[PDB]
């Protein structure tokens, strides 16, 4: 029942409950002449919510906050953006205006500034070196090394064994890489192996775009990234 790109109008947001207190959010956006779905995460944090990633733009992120209030009814108090691209930080200003404390690593904040993207307010400490992990409310944040971007973080939810890979992990339906202008293609397989070694118990793996699956999504992503390298 996970919603697909054809099932979400651009401008609307859907939520999918993965486990007790854990949801993904799904939005869509027009880019380069196609329409893409995009995922983020919502994790219950006591009587508050932690948001992982915007819904890819101001309009979608306003719709995200509305759908969260409608369907969950707890306040989003903190948000973490997992890298500097617009599907992760586009909408940070909407979050900020709604009273959400927005966070990213120092590397993400700097890259967003260089790129011209919205800049989360707070800086996460302890994520500057490959293999670093820190606990941030009900999730563990992990920097696996450069992959889809040099700053990409992944997010693990220990209570539910949910691994949110963000854009470093591809859905199975995606068999080609795409625009890897900001990617470190050469390091990406090693960074995926580091995720595999640090979170081998993950039961549910959420890619940045598209359908969730199991840990197979990690090997799939390596296969796709290597195939692109060889073109
Ligand atoms: O997913 B991103 O974080 O990564 C980059 C490059 N990905 S892309 O191949 O251009 N693409 C495929 C999925 C949607 C865009 C990006 C650019 C613009 C908006 C968002 C993103
Ligand atoms: Cl704040
Ligand atoms: Cl704060
Ligand atoms: Cl992508
Ligand atoms: Na990519
Ligand atoms: Zn990206
Ligand atoms: Zn603050
Ligand atoms: Zn993305």
TrEMBL record:
| Residues engaged in binding Mg(2+) 3 | 138
Localization: Periplasm
Q: What is its EC number?
A: 3.5.2.6
Q: Which residues bind Mg(2+) 2?
A: 12
Binding of Zn(2+) 3 occurs at: 87, 167
Q: Which residues bind Zn(2+) 6?
A: 220
Residues engaged in binding Zn(2+) 5: 122
The cofactors named for this UniProt entry are: Zn(2+)
Ordered alphabetically, the record's keywords are: Antibiotic resistance, Hydrolase, Metal-binding, Periplasm, Plasmid, Signal, Zinc
Please name the GO terms that the record assigns under molecular function: beta-lactamase activity; metal ion binding
Pfam families this protein is in? Lactamase_B
According to the entry, every stretch annotated as the Metallo-beta-lactamase domain falls at 37-209
Q: Kindly list the positions annotated as binding Zn(2+) 1.
A: 47
Q: Name one GO cellular component term.
A: periplasmic space
**Substrates-to-products reaction catalysed:** a beta-lactam + H2O = a substituted beta-amino acid
Which is a GO BP term held by this UniProt record? antibiotic catabolic process
- Residues binding Mg(2+) 4, per UniProt: 171
Could you say which residues bind Zn(2+) 2 here? 83, 85, 87, 148
Summarize the protein's role: Class B beta-lactamase which confers resistance to the beta-lactam antibiotics, including penicillins, cephalosporins and carbapenems. Acts via hydrolysis of the beta-lactam ring. Has penicillin-, cephalosporin- and carbapenem-hydrolyzing activities.
Q: How does it assemble?
A: Monomer.
- Which family would the database say this protein is a member of? Belongs to the metallo-beta-lactamase superfamily. Class-B beta-lactamase family.
**Name of the protein in its database record:** beta-lactamase
